[PDB]
Amino acid sequence: AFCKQLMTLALQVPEKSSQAILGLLQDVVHTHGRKVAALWNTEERKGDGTYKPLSETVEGSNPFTTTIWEGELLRKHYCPKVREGLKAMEKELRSI
């Protein structure tokens, strides 16, 4: 739930704030891995409901039923640090 919301956060924040969040999710992916891997693989997406963005609770949203699509905007972000930061996360994902 936080991983999906944090990519949404990274989309619309100043360059340094976006870079900081990008680095944070790099550690989150590295430390946990398979717990969040299905978010970046469309075949492993759950099919037991629909994603609820504006849920009142963390578990109320169904976050394993969605896919992280924000990489297609952050790859064309104006800040080279953000672009390198995004590439850092996928490099960790590909090494999972």
């Binding site: 870079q19 900081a20 680095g23 944070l24 550690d27």
Partner: peptide
């Protein structure tokens, strides 16, 4: 690692990356 390094307050001064 990276989260701690970017969490320190002296990362967000405001220095432009043209005046290095």
């Amino acid at each position: 690692n990276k989260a701690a390094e970017m969490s320190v307050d002296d990362f967000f001064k405001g220095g432009f990356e043209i005046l290095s």
